[PDB]
């Protein structure tokens, strides 16, 4: 276990556009025909989303390059993957992603999804080891490839899988598996909408909202991010001679939510059907100011949503000596 599955060299990541995708429900209360404004962590419109060819095929001799690098979780992660083969089947959320501090693990097998919060000694190259055990005639799935050991377990959540059982393609179609992860005030929030996509290359200019799915009480610090891939042995063919875990191809997308102010619109059925980013464009700021999508002809004064604090600076006097609070508090006679 914990073998080197990646090579010593990598490639620069591909950059593509988020064509207005990734809005989620920020409240569980039904709202009908309400242009309600809400401030929360939202993915900016027309932003760079990092394309990650985890397994990229190129010609014949250059069979495949494997790369699933650890990423900073930051404010939150917008995860979209459009692979019919069900190669992507889990994620690992954490800090050290080591046994020093606890970490989250969502593994989505066919039978059930398992969410465990333990101190996981993860492998350097985490993946799910699908294999065939001759004894029960079962292609069985091995988790030991994800982490070496699990200890001090604090959570366990078993429920229905949420990937539509990896079926329903019906030929010449693909499913966009979108996910949004947020860690606020000790709660983990996952939002997910899965839709049939026609263009297999990039994101739809189409608009969809991400339904609330689960709100696990994980209670852990989450500064780093990585995904779990499903790989099969390269001894698949008789006479083939490779022990590597080579399989399929993965083309997931990772986007980072940033704090923004949005004017979500709720349709009669209660479904968000359109949304406006206040900072995206001067017109969108006019729509935010008027609180209406239709803006009449003329001149309008608009309030500020465009600029955000990039960093923080603190300026204190040059002070070296500590205060004698130990002198005052620990005095023998008062």
């Amino acid at each position: 276990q914990c073998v080197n599955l990646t090579t010593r060299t990598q490639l620069p990541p591909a950059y593509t556009n988020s064509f207005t995708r990734g809005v989620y429900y920020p409240d569980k209360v039904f709202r009908s025909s309400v242009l309600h404004s809400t401030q929360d962590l939202f993915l900016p419109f027309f932003s760079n989303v990092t394309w990650f060819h985890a397994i990229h095929v190129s010609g014949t001799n250059g069979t495949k390059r494997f790369d699933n690098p650890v990423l900073p979780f930051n404010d939150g992660v917008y995860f979209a993957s459009t692979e019919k083969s069900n190669i992507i089947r889990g994620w690992i959320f954490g800090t050290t992603l080591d046994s020093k501090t606890q970490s989250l693990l969502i593994v989505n097998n066919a039978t059930n999804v398992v969410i465990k919060v333990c101190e996981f000694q993860f492998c350097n190259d985490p993946f799910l080891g699908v294999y065939y055990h001759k004894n029960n005639k079962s292609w069985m799935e091995s988790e030991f490839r994800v982490y070496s050991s699990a200890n001090n377990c604090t959570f366990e959540y078993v429920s229905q899988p949420f990937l539509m059982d990896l079926e329903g393609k019906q030929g010449n179609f693909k499913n966009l598996r979108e996910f949004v992860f947020k860690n606020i005030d000790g709660y983990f929030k996952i939002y997910s909408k899965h839709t049939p996509i026609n263009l297999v290359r990039d994101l739809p200019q189409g608009f969809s909202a991400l339904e609330p799915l689960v709100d696990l009480p994980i209670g852990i610090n989450i500064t780093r991010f990585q995904t779990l891939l499903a790989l099969h042995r390269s001894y698949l063919t008789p006479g083939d001679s490779s022990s590597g875990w080579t399989a399929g191809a993965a083309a997931y997308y990772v986007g980072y939510l940033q704090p923004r102010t949005f004017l979500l619109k709720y349709n009669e059925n209660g479904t968000i059907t359109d949304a406006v980013d206040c900072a995206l464009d001067p017109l969108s700021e006019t729509k935010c100011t008027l609180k209406s999508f239709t803006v009449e002809k003329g001149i309008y004064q608009t309030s500020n949503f465009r600029v955000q604090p990039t960093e923080s600076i603190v300026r204190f006097p040059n002070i070296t000596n500590l205060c004698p609070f130990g002198e005052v508090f620990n005095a023998t006679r008062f």
Epitope: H133, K134, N135, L236, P238, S243
Partner: antibody
């Protein structure tokens, strides 16, 4: 990649029992179907000892039954064999063969009828 | 338990085509199309050249091919060189769940 290691030669006496090992590396025995071989000079090979991928069993030819048995240790990835009642007839070399359980991707359960990977073998001899 | 018939006395010139034949009973060879040949150099581990009658694995040259029709199975050797003089076997799965072999064939350049 997939390397099979053997236990070396064991010279014996007629009537005794021979114990042989076969160690895998780079790939696990739970994922490998294994066949045994009784290579001898001057005569072709015969199939005595195999784990059927199709049948979750380990059967042998009618000529060689009861005289030989198969015990498998999956913890140390070592494959074993007990022979019994060998009286001056075991002059042969024992190759440890193995092949794929089921060829194809994980959805595919198609069977494999092969003995693809071999070891260096063990040259047992009974005097 | 039985054995497959192989003509043990074969030879030929380099760069010439030789067909090596394997013939067996319906009980064994007749039951399936899974007969696979080998390439064992003396005192060496055997290699697999063709599987399931013709499908040849990666790492073998175009010079080795095979076909089985009716009952008798054949291994065809073309473009012969001096390193291919070896002892060859045919191996077929039977209805008794056994992979019986043949007497073997010795080719000499």
């Amino acid at each position: 990649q997939v390397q099979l290691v053997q236990s070396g030669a064991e010279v014996k006496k007629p009537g005794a029992s021979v114990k042989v090992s076969c160690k895998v590396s780079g790939y696990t025995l739970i994922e490998l179907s294994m066949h045994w071989v009784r290579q001898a000079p001057g005569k072709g090979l015969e199939w005595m000892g195999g784990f059927d991928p199709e049948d979750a069993e380990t059967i042998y030819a009618q000529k060689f039954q009861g005289r030989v048995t198969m015990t498998e240790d999956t913890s140390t990835d070592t494959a074993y064999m007990e022979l019994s009642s060998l009286r001056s007839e075991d002059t042969a070399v024992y190759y440890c063969a193995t092949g794929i359980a089921v060829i194809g991707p994980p959805p595919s359960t198609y069977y494999y009828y092969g003995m693809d990977v071999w070891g260096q073998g063990t040259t047992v001899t009974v005097s | 338990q039985s054995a497959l018939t192989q003509p043990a006395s074969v030879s030929g010139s380099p760069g010439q085509s030789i067909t090596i034949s394997c013939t067996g009973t319906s009980s064994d060879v007749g039951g399936y199309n899974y007969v696979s040949w080998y390439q064992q150099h003396p005192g060496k581990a055997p290699k697999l050249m063709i599987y399931d009658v013709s499908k040849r694995p990666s790492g073998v040259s175009n010079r080795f091919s095979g076909s089985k029709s009716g009952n008798t199975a054949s291994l065809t050797i073309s473009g012969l060189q001096a390193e291919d003089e070896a002892d060859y076997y045919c191996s077929s799965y039977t209805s008794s769940s056994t992979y019986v072999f043949g007497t073997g064939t010795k080719v000499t350049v």
